[PDB]
Amino acid sequence: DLKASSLRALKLMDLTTLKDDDTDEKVIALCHQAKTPVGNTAAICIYPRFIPIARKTLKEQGTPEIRIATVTNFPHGNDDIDIALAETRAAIAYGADEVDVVFPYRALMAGNEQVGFDLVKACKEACAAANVLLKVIIETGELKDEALIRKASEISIKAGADFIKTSTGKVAVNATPESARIMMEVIRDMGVEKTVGFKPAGGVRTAEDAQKYLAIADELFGADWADARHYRFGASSLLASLLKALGH
Ligand SMILES: [Mg+2]
Ligand SMILES: [Mg+2]
């Protein structure tokens, strides 16, 4: 049923705005939108500079349980660990609940597996010390090949990713059911489904597509696995489509 999958998907959304024209007022509006008439999203995802006003806004409307996710090393996934760590420490100091860091995928495409491992591990150590979850964006659209998607997923998991996420939403190709299945198969094959969640992101716009992404999760790990600690939708306009499927 689409309605059951849509409500489920809504409660798993990282409701996102990551735009050149973002403003405090736009993030405040996103916070109000996260408190939907059928329930709250799992989180918002915003640039780090909007975290403090977002936290205040979420608290004052009585939804402090809507988590605050942000992005670092974003969107480029450069291989400078000092910079990626510095942005991650800034995100923490701002008040992030979760940091979505971009894996250095161009370095991996060049044959360097080590910098990706160290970059994820450095950011994880900072986040873990602050009780902040770390998601790792591997950019499946640029990786393109299934072997590289598996490898970037494997490196991120071994380096301590709490989530692996398909995409930044800033490149030509983002989440696809094919890329989602590959990444979830890595979680399954590595036996880390209890400690590593999955997050399709970018281009996920319809309730029909959200249903397909959850179906893959249900198929691989059972219908009870995809909770907020283990599954998120990185999306924006998807919320309107999920609500329309629900009667709002
Ligand atoms: Mg470099
Ligand atoms: Mg070393």
Residue numbers in the entry: 3 to 250
Please share excerpts from the published article on this structure.
The crystal structure of Ec DERA N21K variant, which had lowered specific activity on DRP, and wild-type like activity on DR and acetaldehyde, was determined with and without the ligand, D-2-deoxyribose-5-phosphate (DRP). The complex structure of Ec DERA N21K mutant revealed binding of the reaction product from DRP cleavage, i.e. glyceraldehyde-3-phosphate (C3P), to the acceptor site in one of the two protein molecules in the asymmetric unit. In addition, in both N21K crystal structures, there are slight (about 0.2 to 0.4 Å) movements in the positions of altogether three active site loops containing residues G171, G204 and L20, respectively, when compared with the wild-type DERA crystal structure. Most of these residues (i.e. G171, G204, S238 and S239, N21) are according to the structural data (by others and us, see also below) involved in binding the phosphate group of the glyceraldehyde-3-phosphate acceptor substrate.
Deoxyribose-5-phosphate aldolases (DERAs) are acetaldehyde-dependent, Class I aldolases catalysing in nature a reversible aldol reaction between an acetaldehyde donor (C2 compound) and glyceraldehyde-3-phosphate acceptor (C3 compound, C3P) to generate deoxyribose-5-phosphate, DRP (C5 compound). The 3D structures of several DERA enzymes have been solved, and there are also a few complex structures available. The DERA reaction proceeds via Schiff base formation between an active site lysine residue (K167 in Ec DERA) and the donor acetaldehyde substrate. The active site of DERA is located in a deep binding cleft, where the donor acetaldehyde binds to the bottom of the cleft and the acceptor glyceraldehyde-3-phosphate to the upper part, near the cleft entrance.
